[PDB]
Design an enzyme around this catalytic site. Structure first.
Site, PDB file in Angstrom:
ATOM      1  N   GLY C 132      37.738  71.020  -4.884  1.00  0.00           N
ATOM      2  CA  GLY C 132      38.503  70.457  -3.890  1.00  0.00           C
ATOM      3  C   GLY C 132      39.743  70.024  -4.169  1.00  0.00           C
ATOM      4  O   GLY C 132      40.245  70.116  -5.350  1.00  0.00           O
ATOM      5  N   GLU C 243      29.822  60.581 -30.116  1.00  0.00           N
ATOM      6  CA  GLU C 243      28.897  61.207 -31.042  1.00  0.00           C
ATOM      7  C   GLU C 243      28.509  62.406 -29.791  1.00  0.00           C
ATOM      8  O   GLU C 243      28.389  63.618 -30.572  1.00  0.00           O
ATOM      9  CB  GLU C 243      27.746  60.499 -30.967  1.00  0.00           C
ATOM     10  CG  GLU C 243      26.558  61.093 -32.034  1.00  0.00           C
ATOM     11  CD  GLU C 243      25.731  60.001 -32.498  1.00  0.00           C
ATOM     12  OE1 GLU C 243      25.566  58.913 -32.086  1.00  0.00           O
ATOM     13  OE2 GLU C 243      24.682  60.416 -32.906  1.00  0.00           O
TER      14      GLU C 243
END
Ligand SMILES: Nc1nc2c(ncn2[C@@H]2O[C@H](COP(=O)(O)OP(=O)(O)OP(=O)(O)O)[C@@H](O)[C@H]2O)c(=O)[nH]1
Ligand SMILES: Nc1nc2c(ncn2[C@@H]2O[C@H](COP(=O)(O)OP(=O)(O)OP(=O)(O)O)[C@@H](O)[C@H]2O)c(=O)[nH]1
Ligand SMILES: Nc1nc2c(ncn2[C@@H]2O[C@H](COP(=O)(O)OP(=O)(O)O)[C@@H](O)[C@H]2O)c(=O)[nH]1
Ligand SMILES: Nc1nc2c(ncn2[C@@H]2O[C@H](COP(=O)(O)OP(=O)(O)O)[C@@H](O)[C@H]2O)c(=O)[nH]1
Ligand SMILES: [Mg+2]
Ligand SMILES: [Mg+2]
EC number: 3.6.5.-
Lengths: 428, 426, 428, 426
Positions: C132, C243
């Protein structure tokens, strides 16, 4: 430990109305003066009525009559309410000279009477507007006398800064230029705010698209109370008015510290949001809360004073300062180290019942002297110039005895002032 | 603090008939003279226009002047003609006939001494005058002729008081007197430099408004003079009543006059629309500003966008925000920057009163000083010249002793005002 | 340990609505913010109200208004709810440039305000859609600024993958191609899902032939919560967002891990059937539960991360891994050994009251980077090409200042990206 | 965010009479002007079409234009003619007579200045315009003639706003004006390049639908214009009300226009069948899609399967699944792949609103841009040529100054649109 408030002109008086209303709110003072409970501002009667040590001057009966017919008419002593019959007509030439000069002697004698009521006059402050006839005309007249009699007392002025976009007074540049000339040289410090900037504050922080002067002056009153009520009340760092002057005025010219105030928050905006001391002070360095339309980022800082209300721990303040010194883009002038006055009152911030601002537990007022002020003068320079080059409206002053040379001179004094700002901007 | 009003000429007398009516409406004063209101403010500042006579009678501080008893009588015969004291009716006998020379120069001159004496009596009755106001027609014999004479003497006695006047300006289409431009020319010659300010009312424009926006098909002069009085009363009430801004007539005069000689005004008024649309109108500050700016709502047959605006005054009545007013005026200045004069920064000034006109929530008075005004002067001057060359009806005037060189100078002076508007039109 | 969620566009916001609803469900947060009990996402007030640290951006008032009128309107701070007046019109040219660029400064300052509220900003994630106007246009604009200010913080993006068969946006290829160009280079990792594939999941595993976006986003919310709520909650192997980035992104290009989620089971399907950790992970490697219509068997794996909720014993996980490594047909790229991140939270899986998914006692989320993604780009390549060859709709971008060369360039950047996938596919 | 609508010509004025009726139905606004609804949404987005005037009066943001007071009067005389303010009735006196030259080129041109002034007043009344919409006939004098003139000036003032129009296209069988193709030709010449998009309505097709599927034997124009308003109102409500998809008019325009010059649309509508069968109908998404695709439910006398489809918009109102909609649209694309253009992958686009039209559970609006449209242009162009050679009624037009070379260029331009449809028909 006493002081005198002086309200000249509508702006001075209507702001004063808010101010004294707030002082009543600070202690629970009844409209009749009965207080069940701040004698630095008030004088006590045997009935336990206290009289606000202030003088109200209007050369047109109407505004004082508004006082006289309101609730606080019982509070004020009839002699404090001084009125003439005719106006200055937006015009220094009548305000300072032709008209106001007739009544000023009375005014001064009421002031002197109060000065005799004072036991330890610390000083005083004058509320007015830079563009009006009495607002600036008469005002400077007063300073001319007060600086003689009270030469060693605090001479703090507060004035409305002419909005760059809206002004109702076509000769306001001329008025303000003449005041520069005469106030710079007599006053100690003049503070100012921009109603246009305030409107932006009202619509963005209070979310109000309908501000009237009675809203606008409440906000001003907040700022004033922080430096007037709470500086006489207890705190950690109890800062006096003379101390303010001694900590805010760096040069013998004037200086013009501008106001910034954060928190200015609507009740709904207060919900869901936790302010800390540091967060409030972050807001204080944002252009967005600047009470004068002048860009803080444009100029350089010379002075800065932060005054704290309510739940403020110096510990947090110290951390906040560290970050404003190092995190921000605040450029500052060489001359100055960052000795920013920290006033820390335990006295909590107060809110006007039925007002717009949210109840806050802590609050910070900021005064600042920035080099961007010269741009404000530049605005006046051209506005004055345009009129003066055409000599539009000049006959309204000349007919009262004003001199064209004088007007040129006053502009030049402003130019000199701008040049001194230039000087300060040059770092050294 | 007080004002004295003098009406003259059939026009002026009939306009004043509506003006005073309205003022008493504003204060709740009965057609017979006593106060039967109901607001504190209604009596509080009544002093500017009324003397309270014994018995709680209020006397309008004004003098009604004419040279024919019958007009005066007709005024006296209606409600509010009873509130005026007999001593305020000063009149002679035998017309003027719409002749300046008679009015000013000769016969009417004779009456003026008695008028002035009463004026003096009232000036003493006041505590402190703010000024004087006169109502009259520019092309009329007593309206302008005698009226002007009076003005020159009042100004002489009180240099320090406001001298203004509202006057009917000869409309392009309806002149009554063949030498109406002559009388007008002579009044410019005398008035402009003997007044602080004058307002320009065009009946033609008024008739257009009453049908154009008010959609009315029956007005009379009383209905149009109602509109006139709306603007007149609009100005002084603020001065009288509590507001926000700066409510002093002199200050208005100061803000509206950039130059000693160019003090002509274009009045306008808002809101001012038919009842049908009143169900489809919204009442906001921009709404009033739309009506105020629009040239069709001007009461003067001028076109401000043709000329340049020197000064604009926007007077507001009723509760409005300061912000909104400030912003909309700014917007006006911004969007119509092509009409404003560059020499005056922020040429639109405001005044705010918190008291609405009876029956409305809000209202606004437009006062302007444009260069467009010069067009009226040009029309008159031209017409004048033609007549001047022929001496039309000047035997009546020269028969009463008016000299053609005085008229010649009058012509110049008209042309001078036009050239000065050009000098500041740029 | 804090993070910021950013919801741009309808897709971003409506997904966000589900997400924050789920976080409320995770802790029992009341619509007014009152929580009786996760401060990594929330900021606490003295009332015990917590504010979700997130920004909602819509350039059309409507969707934000939907928030503002719903129950969670009390939860969100009015400043978090940012809206413009006009749309991007499905068009990067307005979303990134002409329109969205006007408001972005505000948006950024609200973000920065929250960044200042963070004490330990770990990072953030952005919810949007690849096709969009604001969904991708504005989004990349934001990344352009956020990558400067927050260069070292997590920049995870989540976006709806344009369905190959149904799309409501005719210039979606063009939008997505432009985003590639600008997001690849700025973002750290972008995840995506295919609503068409999801429909197949809804009809086959949930047995629902009537999915709406409000269903579809619940499922997305599940996946997101596994990596957002449960990664901050306690487990055996507590895995952080940084992480995640450090364990999922192998190259400095982007990479685009795709989501897979198993269990997705209707209540009736849960009956009579016992899932184990291993069985759930078996489902995770089935094409059938692949959230993007792209065949897992086509490409080769590069990365894979498995995140566990509820009743998961590492013992079982280990066995499961052994079998997926050896039993399956999962081809993988040489470069990689099978170091698949295992996150193991004790935090149980949660279910939306009134939702479609069955209460489960354990759950597994899978992220994976497969070479089959180049086929997705191939789809875009031709769709773009067709339009661009004809220059259909081109005037809707050109009129906003877009350049044709730029569009070619962006395609070429995509082609380069495809080539890098080709490269990875070549084993070495 | 807001829209201004202008109606012109007897057609346009009568269509708008139904359009506004429906809009007020949608929001619960009474024929007299006040709001008496009952849903939050009803007031919530009312701004796009109404100004709330003081008293909780809603003013439709539209201008009614004609050159004969009587038509305007008849509009005003019914319910909802009272909701319009008098200021929105802009009209002259003496027709146009269905003459382009009068409408556009000469006389009607005179009125346009007053129309535009009101337009400006409304553009200021809006906070932020999304666009403008006009209703008119292609072969009419004020409908197209004057209307076109207005459009060229509005576009000039607002390049950044949506300019679209719906217009009655001369049906093959019922032309009223002998030079109706001439007026239409001239309007193409002017409109196509001065509009963002135009809709093609054929009354003949409408009369077929009303009997063909609706099985009605009494319609009038009000019943057929109801159908027209159904499509018009269908479009804007979604923009107004909460939905699922992408509810912005501009975005619609973007998705439907592949090429700067080819912006003509074929509206259609579902469900749209007689009551008898309503007891035998099922309400599903495929049901709506069957009605939407079927050429007989088109309001334009075209045949989309004759031409090629460039773009398709499917707008849905009411609660539907996303899945179902997606799948059925895909199926349509699949099964009718022979009509779609290969250059645009997935040429069928959708928009979804969750608010159903009052009284129905669901509904859908079909908007298409096919090449089939060119057939209408071809019919007109041909008819035009014949008339062109003979100058039928061109003395009326040339008598008012319309030059034949301008018409020549108009003819070319028609032919250009056809050739460009051929260029993308392939
Ligand atoms: N903040 C604030 N500004 C005000 C207030 N009243 C007036 N002002 C501003 O002060 C200036 C107006 O001065 P005036 O009211 O015209 O005049 P004055 O200074 O009272 O004295 P005179 O000209 O003799 O009447 C303008 O710039 C106003 O915007 C008020 O209550 N609050
Ligand atoms: N999963 C999911 N996908 C959605 C949702 N809403 C929209 N989409 C998809 O995202 C794309 C739609 O983007 P739009 O709604 O048109 O636009 P936007 O990105 O919000 O921004 P604008 O074009 O400026 O309105 C389509 O591919 C839709 O299928 C939703 O709630 N959930
Ligand atoms: N508005 C207005 N104009 C008037 C009235 N009466 C006369 N006039 C105008 O005044 C001019 C005629 O002057 P007139 O008043 O008869 O002069 P005088 O009576 O001899 O002083 C004409 O232009 C009239 O339109 C009135 O009641 N209202
Ligand atoms: N649908 C429809 N068509 C109309 C209406 N009125 C006139 N028409 C059509 O408009 C054409 C005639 O133009 P007309 O509207 O009279 O032009 P004008 O009034 O001079 O601008 C014919 O093709 C009619 O079928 C109507 O109320 N509805
Ligand atoms: Mg004053
Ligand atoms: Mg959107």
């Amino acid at each position: 430990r006493e002081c005198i408030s002086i309200h000249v002109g509508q702006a001075g008086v209507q702001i004063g109305n808010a101010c004294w209303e707030l002082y009543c709110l600070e202690h629970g003072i009844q409209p009749d003066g009965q207080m069940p409970s701040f004698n630095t501002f008030f004088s006590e009667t045997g009935a336990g009525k206290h009289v606000p040590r202030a003088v109200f001057v209007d050369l047109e009966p109407t505004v004082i009559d508004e006082v006289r017919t309101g609730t606080y008419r019982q509070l004020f002593h009839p002699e404090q309410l001084i009125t003439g019959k005719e106006d200055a007509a937006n015009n220094y030439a009548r305000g300072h000279y032709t008209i106001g000069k007739e009544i000023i002697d009375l005014v001064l004698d009421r002031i002197r009477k109060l000065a005799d009521q004072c036991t330890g006059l610390q000083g005083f402050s004058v509320f007015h507007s830079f563009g009006g006839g009495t607002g600036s005309g008469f005002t400077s007249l007063l300073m001319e006398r007060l600086s003689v009699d009270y030469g060693k007392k605090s001479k703090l002025e507060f004035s409305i800064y002419p909005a760059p976009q809206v002004s109702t007074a076509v000769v306001e540049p001329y008025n303000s230029i003449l005041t520069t000339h005469t106030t710079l040289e007599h006053s100690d410090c003049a503070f100012m705010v921009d109603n246009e900037a305030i409107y932006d504050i009202c619509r963005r922080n209070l979310d109000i698209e309908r501000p009237t002067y009675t809203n606008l002056n409440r906000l001003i009153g907040q700022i004033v109370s922080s430096i007037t009520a709470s500086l006489r009340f207890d705190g950690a760092l109890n800062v006096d008015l003379t101390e303010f002057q001694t900590n805010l005025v760096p040069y013998p010219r004037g200086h013009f510290p501008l106001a910034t105030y954060a928190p200015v928050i609507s009740a709904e905006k207060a919900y869901h949001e936790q302010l800390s001391v540091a967060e409030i002070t972050n807001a204080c360095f944002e252009p967005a809360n600047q009470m004068v339309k002048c860009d803080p980022r444009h100029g350089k800082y010379m002075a800065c004073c932060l005054l704290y209300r309510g739940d403020v721990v110096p510990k947090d303040v110290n951390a906040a300062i560290a970050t404003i010194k190092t995190k921000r883009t605040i450029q500052f002038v060489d001359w100055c180290p960052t000795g920013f006055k920290v006033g820390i009152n335990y006295e909590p911030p107060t809110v006007v019942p039925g007002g717009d601002l949210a109840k806050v537990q802590r609050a910070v007022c900021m005064l600042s002297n920035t080099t961007a002020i010269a741009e404000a003068w530049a605005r006046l320079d051209h506005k004055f110039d345009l009129m003066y080059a055409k000599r539009a409206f000049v006959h309204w002053y000349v007919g009262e005895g004003m001199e064209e040379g004088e007007f040129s001179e006053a502009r030049e004094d402003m130019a000199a002032l701008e040049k001194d700002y230039e000087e300060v901007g040059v770092d050294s | 603090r007080e004002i004295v009003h003098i009406q003259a000429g059939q026009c002026g007398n009939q306009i004043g008939a509506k003006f005073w009516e309205v003022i008493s409406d504003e204060h709740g004063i009965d057609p017979t003279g006593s106060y039967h209101g109901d607001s504190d403010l209604q009596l509080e500042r009544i002093n500017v226009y009324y003397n309270e006579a014994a018995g709680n009678k209020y006397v309008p501080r004004a003098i009604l002047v004419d040279l024919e008893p019958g007009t005066m009588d007709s005024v006296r015969s209606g409600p509010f003609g009873q509130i005026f004291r007999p001593d305020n009716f000063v009149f002679g006998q035998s017309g003027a006939g719409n002749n300046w020379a008679k009015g000013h120069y000769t016969e009417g001159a004779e009456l003026v001494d008695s008028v002035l004496d009463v004026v003096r009596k009232e000036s003493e009755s006041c505590d402190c005058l703010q000024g004087f106001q006169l109502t009259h027609s520019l092309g009329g014999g007593t309206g302008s002729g005698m009226g002007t004479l009076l003005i020159s003497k009042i100004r002489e006695e009180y240099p320090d008081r406001i001298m203004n006047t509202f006057s009917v300006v000869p409309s392009p289409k309806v002149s009554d007197t063949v030498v109406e431009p002559y009388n007008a020319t002579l009044s410019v010659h005398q008035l402009v430099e003997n007044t602080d300010e004058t307002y320009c009312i065009d009946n033609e424009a008024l008739y257009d408004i009453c049908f154009r926006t008010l959609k009315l098909t029956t007005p009379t002069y009383g209905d149009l003079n109602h509109l006139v009085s709306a603007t007149m009363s609009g100005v002084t009430t603020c001065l009288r009543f509590p507001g926000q801004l700066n409510a002093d007539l002199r200050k208005l005069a100061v803000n509206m006059v950039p130059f000693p000689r160019l003090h002509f005004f274009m009045p306008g008024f808002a809101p001012l629309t038919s009842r049908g649309s009143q169900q489809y109108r919204a009442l906001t500050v921009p709404e009033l500003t739309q009506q105020m700016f629009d040239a069709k709502n001007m009461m003067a047959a001028c076109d401000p966008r043709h000329g340049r605006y020197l000064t604009v005054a926007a007077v507001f009545r009723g509760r409005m925000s300061m912000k909104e007013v400030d912003e909309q005026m700014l917007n006006v200045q911004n969007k119509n920057s092509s009409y404003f004069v560059e020499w005056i920064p922020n040429n639109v000034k405001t005044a705010v009163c918190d008291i609405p006109p009876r029956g409305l929530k809000m209202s606004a008075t437009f006062i302007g000083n444009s260069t467009a005004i010069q067009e009226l002067f040009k029309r008159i001057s031209e017409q004048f010249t033609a007549m001047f060359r022929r001496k039309a009806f000047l035997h009546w005037y020269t028969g009463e002793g008016m000299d053609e060189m005085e008229f010649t100078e009058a012509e110049s002076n008209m042309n001078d005002l036009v050239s000065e508007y050009q000098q500041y039109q740029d």
